[PDB]
């Protein structure tokens, strides 16, 4: 409790549990808003292909589900009388998945906006757009992997 496990350790497990869903929600909100200004501006002189253009909004929703996954696993390992090691690992995992989700959401929004705009002139660009949006989608998955590997070792061999 002294030489390990202080009383301010769950602070770093609370902020790191809140940091994931906040910054993944900022990335998802930017991606949704930017893509949905591209939609409803390119689908106003063309009411068909409105419902096929909602691909980037699905991607931003997946970016939010990543941070919803990490914040539930960090919450169940919180508790009074835990180590500083566990709190630092939980903060690092939360910041990792949150800011990777923020970067991936900016990429999804900016690419999907231009792709949805320019796909109303060239129908072979849609298949191109998804092929770029997967490359922006795997950026969030890398931070999700780092968060899962950190949270796997937050309480292994911890006294």
């Amino acid at each position: 409790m002294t030489e390990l496990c202080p009383v301010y350790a769950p602070f770093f497990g609370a902020i790191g549990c809140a940091s994931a869903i906040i910054f993944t929600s900022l990335g998802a909100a930017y991606g949704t808003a930017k893509s949905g200004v591209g939609i409803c501006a390119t689908c106003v002189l063309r009411p068909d292909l409105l419902f096929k253009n909602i691909v980037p909004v699905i991607m931003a929703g997946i970016i939010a589900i990543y941070g919803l996954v990490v914040s539930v696993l960090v919450c169940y390992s919180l508790g009074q009388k835990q180590a500083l090691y566990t709190g630092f690992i939980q903060l690092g995992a939360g910041l990792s998945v949150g800011l990777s989700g923020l970067a991936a959401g900016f990429a999804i929004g900016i690419v999907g906006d231009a792709g949805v705009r320019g796909s109303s002139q060239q129908p072979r660009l849609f298949v191109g757009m998804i092929l770029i949006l997967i490359f922006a989608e795997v950026l969030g998955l890398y931070g999700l992997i780092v968060a899962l590997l950190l949270n796997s070792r937050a309480t292994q061999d911890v006294v």
Partner: protein
């Protein structure tokens, strides 16, 4: 000038004013005027199976479709349509056409969302294919009576399937009725589609009746008009009942624009391919690839290419569809040109086909080639 339509429901407002909610004495309130040779003909759309086991005896659509059939300007074209349809509903070849198009009568979240978004995109491209196919029959030389309501039915069904796929993907992603009804009634507005006859069927199973404003019956009708006539069924050496159904089949197939020696078999299957007798003639598959390359690269390259191809100008396609767009590069705007790069081996094959038959262009828009 093959067909014209209207959408104002206040001109013939007598038969839709009060609560006329019964097929019983619906023809008795239908005279109401000097209509003698033009009153019982409009009832003939709902006369066979509009009372004999009819739900509600009317609805909002089934009675509005009867008085939008104003035929007072001329009653010859729809009379030939009433003689041509239901003379075709006798052979078993039409019966099996109405059986293939009818019934008997975690990571799994990513997989289900992929299925729904595939449904949305595939049923959304075909609606655009049909919207640029109802301006091909706007061109001179085509028809606007049998083609126009036939391909305004398929676009509505594809728009409904696209909205259904998007609503399904959204409802599945946000979790793992009132939205589908909001897109259903919205597509019921705008222009008004012309009528086609009803195609009642009376076989040994029972008295069936399909609608031709539903996409299943439309999709089952054009598969019937596909194959060419054989050595039988048209000769005057087995004249049993063929000069009333095969003549009707051929006049519909010509009314679309298809020659009597064109085959056009559907190709959607999981089985082995079109063997050799239903397989094309190697100047058609090349032309079909040229049409698919025209559809896949622009949203406005099918109608001007068909307009040029009807004039015999199908070698001048590369330099009449070219147009310039800007590109803001690192050295200023440059105004490059997009053009359909047809090869010569598919530019002369479009010379082999004189005029594209509308039946071929409707298998093209539905995905059967």
């Amino acid at each position: 000038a093959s067909v014209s339509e209207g959408v104002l429901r206040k001109k013939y407002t007598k038969f839709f004013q009060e609560n006329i909610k019964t097929h019983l004495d619906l023809k008795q309130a239908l005279l109401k005027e000097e209509k003698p040779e033009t009153a019982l003909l409009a009832y003939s759309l709902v006369s066979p199976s509009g009372y004999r086991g009819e739900p509600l005896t009317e609805r909002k659509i089934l009675e509005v479709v009867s008085l939008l059939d104003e035929v007072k300007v001329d009653g010859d074209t729809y009379q030939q349509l009433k003689n041509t349809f239901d003379s075709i509903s006798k052979d078993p070849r039409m019966q099996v056409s109405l059986e293939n198009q009818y019934p008997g009568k975690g990571v799994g979240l990513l997989v289900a969302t992929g299925r729904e978004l595939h449904k949305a995109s595939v049923n959304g491209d075909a609606e655009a294919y049909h919207h640029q196919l109802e301006q091909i029959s706007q061109l001179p030389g085509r028809d606007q009576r049998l083609s126009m309501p036939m391909q305004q039915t398929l676009a509505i069904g594809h728009a409904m399937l696209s909205a259904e796929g998007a609503v399904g993907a959204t409802l599945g992603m946000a979790t793992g009725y009132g939205l589908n009804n909001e897109v259903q009634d919205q597509l019921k507005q705008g222009p008004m589609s012309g009528v086609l006859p009803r195609l009642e069927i009376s076989n040994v199973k029972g008295d069936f009746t399909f609608s031709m404003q539903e996409p299943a019956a439309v999709r089952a009708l054009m598969a019937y008009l596909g194959p060419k006539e054989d050595t039988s069924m048209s000769s005057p050496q087995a004249p049993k009942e063929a000069q009333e159904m095969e003549a009707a089949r051929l006049t519909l197939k010509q009314m679309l624009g298809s020659s009597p020696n064109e085959h056009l078999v559907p190709d959607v299957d999981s089985l082995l391919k079109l063997s050799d007798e239903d397989m094309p003639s190697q100047t058609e598959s090349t032309a079909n690839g040229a049409f698919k390359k025209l559809l896949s690269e622009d949203w406005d390259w099918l109608m001007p290419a068909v307009r040029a191809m009807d004039k015999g100008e199908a070698g001048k396609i590369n330099e009449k569809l070219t147009y310039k767009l800007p590109l803001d590069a690192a050295n200023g705007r440059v105004y490059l040109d997009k053009s359909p790069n047809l090869s010569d081996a598919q530019l002369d094959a479009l010379d082999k086909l004189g005029s594209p038959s509308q039946l071929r262009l409707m298998y093209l828009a539905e995905g059967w080639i």
